[PDB]
Amino acid sequence: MTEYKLVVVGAVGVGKSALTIQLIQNHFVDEYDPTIEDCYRKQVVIDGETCLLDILDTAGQEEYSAMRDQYMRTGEGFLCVFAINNTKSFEDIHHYREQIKRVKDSEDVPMVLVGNKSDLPSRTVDTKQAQDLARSYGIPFIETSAKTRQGVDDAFYTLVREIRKH
Numbered sequence: 001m002t003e004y005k006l007v008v009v010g011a012v013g014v015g016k017s018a019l020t021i022q023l024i025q026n027h028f029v030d031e032y033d034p035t036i037e038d039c040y041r042k043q044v045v046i047d048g049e050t051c052l053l054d055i056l057d058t059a060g061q062e063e064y065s066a067m068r069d070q071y072m073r074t075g076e077g078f079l080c081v082f083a084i085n086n087t088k089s090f091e092d093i094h095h096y097r098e099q100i101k102r103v104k105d106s107e108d109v110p111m112v113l114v115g116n117k118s119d120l121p122s123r124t125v126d127t128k129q130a131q132d133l134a135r136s137y138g139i140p141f142i143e144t145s146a147k148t149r150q151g152v153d154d155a156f157y158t159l160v161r162e163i164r165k166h
């Protein structure tokens, strides 16, 4: 059956691991080693079509490695994650976006922009400015909380739809 290869990228601490573990294991893990990169696989059903998701939860020290480049070439879609209380992580999106397009040598790569930690009160990044950036990229924007589950399945499933459309 169909497999979708997803790569979760973004600055350290934005919640890549928390998002991935919430999606797969349905619980919020609050102090997951920042240095661990790993693959999470799970069978799921999406719009009826039964699926295998292969999700790469990236670690920052691997950024310029030959292995990262191969993983990006293999990856079919990218969840580009920032935190809504961390402006720098939002500004880093530009960097990850350009890297993915370069490494995969394409201007149209399946992607979703994710603004995580939506449960936190101290917002520094407006939804509108994230929506504006996503529009400029021509990709969906989904706001999530790995802690509460809000938006998590939508983020990942929407990325699968983006891969289908491609």
Ligand SMILES: Nc1nc2c(ncn2[C@@H]2O[C@H](COP(=O)(O)OP(=O)(O)O)[C@@H](O)[C@H]2O)c(=O)[nH]1
Residues within 6 Å of the ligand: 010, 011, 012, 013, 014, 015, 016, 017, 018, 019, 029, 030, 031, 032, 033, 034, 116, 117, 118, 119, 120, 144, 145, 146, 147, 148
């Ligand atoms: N309140 C809240 N905390 C979060 C959320 N996602 C991650 N965190 C916390 O933010 C920190 C970094 O999360 P982590 O998943 O390790 O980030 P990574 O470096 O992108 O893998 C951890 O302390 C998590 O508990 C969220 O949606 N809400």
Ligand SMILES: *Sc1cccc2ccccc12
Residues within 6 Å of the ligand: 005, 006, 007, 038, 039, 040, 041, 054, 055, 056, 071, 072, 074, 075, 076
């Ligand atoms: S989850 C996983 C494991 C190995 C290689 C991958 C490439 C791209 C996406 C996900 C991967």
Ligand SMILES: [Mg+2]
Residues within 6 Å of the ligand: 016, 017, 018, 032, 033, 034, 035, 036, 057, 058, 059
């Ligand atoms: Mg992590």
